[PDB]
Design a protein around this ligand. Structure first.
Ligand SMILES: *[C@@H]1O[C@H](CO)[C@@H](O)[C@H](O)[C@H]1NC(C)=O
Ligand SMILES: *[C@@H]1O[C@H](CO)[C@@H](O)[C@H](O)[C@H]1NC(C)=O
Ligand SMILES: *[C@@H]1O[C@H](CO)[C@@H](O)[C@H](O)[C@H]1NC(C)=O
Ligand SMILES: *[C@@H]1O[C@H](CO)[C@@H](O)[C@H](O)[C@H]1NC(C)=O
Ligand SMILES: *[C@@H]1O[C@H](CO)[C@@H](O)[C@H](O)[C@H]1NC(C)=O
Ligand SMILES: *[C@@H]1O[C@H](CO)[C@@H](O)[C@H](O)[C@H]1NC(C)=O
Ligand SMILES: *[C@@H]1O[C@H](CO)[C@@H](O)[C@H](O)[C@H]1NC(C)=O
Ligand SMILES: *[C@@H]1O[C@H](CO)[C@@H](O)[C@H](O)[C@H]1NC(C)=O
Ligand SMILES: *[C@@H]1O[C@H](CO)[C@@H](O)[C@H](O)[C@H]1NC(C)=O
Ligand SMILES: *[C@@H]1O[C@H](CO)[C@@H](O)[C@H](O)[C@H]1NC(C)=O
Ligand SMILES: *[C@@H]1O[C@H](CO)[C@@H](O)[C@H](O)[C@H]1NC(C)=O
Ligand SMILES: *[C@@H]1O[C@H](CO)[C@@H](O)[C@H](O)[C@H]1NC(C)=O
Lengths: 135, 135, 135
């Protein structure tokens, strides 16, 4: 993961952020640039060789080699009564982003209950922009 | 994952963000650029060799080699009564993005209960823009 | 993870942030640049060789070699009654981002209950921008 970037307003290799009142003139700004990037990553050469009970040559009664489980998860239990029992909102809004009593959930799961798993996984997750940009 | 980017308003390799009042003139701005990018990633050369109980040559009674389970997940249980028992909203809005009592859920799952899985998975997830841009 | 960056407003290799009132002129600004980057990372050459009970040659009764479990997680239990029992909100807002009684949850899980797992995982997670930019 080479560039996990979080630039705030903006990114740029070569920028001229000139943004208030600036009489500027007769500039030469010669720019030779050689920005080579090389990426030679994640060269897996693996030989797992994953094996159960290779050679029971004779008479070996085997039993219960791999008991995974039993198991529960019960991950998300809000259990939120919220018995206000007198609501008088009287809610005057102006140009406000306003989230009320919302349940934003992003449950991303992968590679669950898999005996074996080679190679690789990847879970990216962007989040909301939500730009009012009011007057 | 080379560029997991989150640029805020904008990205640009070579930009001129000139955005207030700026008399500018007679500029040469020569730009030689060699931006080569090379990506040589994720070269898997794997030999899993995944095997159960290769050679029971003789008389081996085998039993219960791999008991996965039993199991439950029960992931999302809101259980949200919300018995207000007197609602007088009286809700005057102006140019407001307003989420009320919404349940945004994005449940992304993959590769579940798979004995074996080679290669790779990938779960991207963008989120909402929601740009009012009011007056 | 080479650049886990968190730039605040902005990033740039070669910038000219000129943003208040500045008479500037006759500048030469010659820039020879050789910004080569090389990335030769994560070259796995592994030979796991992961194996149970290779050779029971004779008569060995085996039993319960690997009992994982039983187990629970029960991760998220809000259990939030919030019985206000007299709500008089009277909530006048001006151009305010306002989150009220919201439950932002991002549950990212991966590679769960997997006997073996080669290669690599990756969980990025961006978060919300939420730029009002009011008057
Ligand atoms: C910009 O260049 C011209 C031509 O060489 C020169 O006459 C002028 O004086 C320069 N600008 C200023 C503000 O002097
Ligand atoms: C520009 O940069 C390249 C790469 O280093 C170089 O080969 C070339 O000679 C340079 N040219 C000038 C005019 O500086
Ligand atoms: C991968 O491993 C095998 C086994 O030793 C070897 O013969 C081969 O040259 C390796 N290749 C690379 C690119 O590492
Ligand atoms: C194997 O595991 C199961 C799972 O509970 C159990 O019921 C059984 O008795 C075990 N076998 C032996 C021989 O103990
Ligand atoms: C821009 O260039 C012209 C021609 O060389 C020059 O006469 C002028 O003075 C320059 N600009 C300014 C503001 O001086
Ligand atoms: C521009 O850059 C390339 C790459 O380095 C180089 O071969 C070429 O000579 C350069 N030309 C000039 C005019 O700088
Ligand atoms: C892949 O592995 C095999 C086994 O050793 C080897 O013969 C071959 O050269 C390897 N190839 C690469 C590109 O690594
Ligand atoms: C194998 O596992 C099952 C799962 O509960 C169990 O009922 C059974 O008794 C097990 N076998 C032995 C021989 O214990
Ligand atoms: C900028 O360059 C011109 C031409 O050489 C020169 O006459 C002028 O005086 C310079 N600017 C200022 C403010 O002197
Ligand atoms: C620019 O930099 C490159 C790389 O070091 C070099 O080969 C070239 O000669 C340089 N050119 C000048 C004009 O400085
Ligand atoms: C990987 O390991 C094998 C086993 O010793 C060896 O033959 C091979 O040269 C190695 N390759 C690399 C690129 O390390
Ligand atoms: C093997 O483990 C299971 C799991 O509880 C148990 O019931 C069983 O009695 C164990 N076997 C022996 C021989 O103890």
């Amino acid at each position: 993961s080479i560039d996990v970037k979080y630039i705030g307003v903006k990114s740029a290799y070569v920028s001229y952020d000139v943004q208030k009142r600036t009489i500027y003139l007769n500039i030469t700004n010669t720019l030779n640039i050689t920005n080579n990037n090389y990426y030679s990553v994640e060269v897996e050469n693996i030989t797992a060789q994953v094996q159960f009970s290779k050679t029971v040559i004779g008479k070996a009664r085997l039993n219960n080699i791999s008991i995974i489980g039993p198991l529960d998860m019960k991950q998300i239990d809000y259990t939120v009564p919220t018995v206000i029992a007198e609501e008088m909102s009287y809610m005057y809004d102006f140009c406000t982003l306003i989230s009320i009593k919302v349940h934003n959930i992003v449950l991303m799961m992968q590679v669950t209950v898999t005996t074996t798993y080679f190679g690789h996984s990847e879970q990216i997750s962007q989040e909301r922009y939500q730009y009012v940009d009011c007057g």
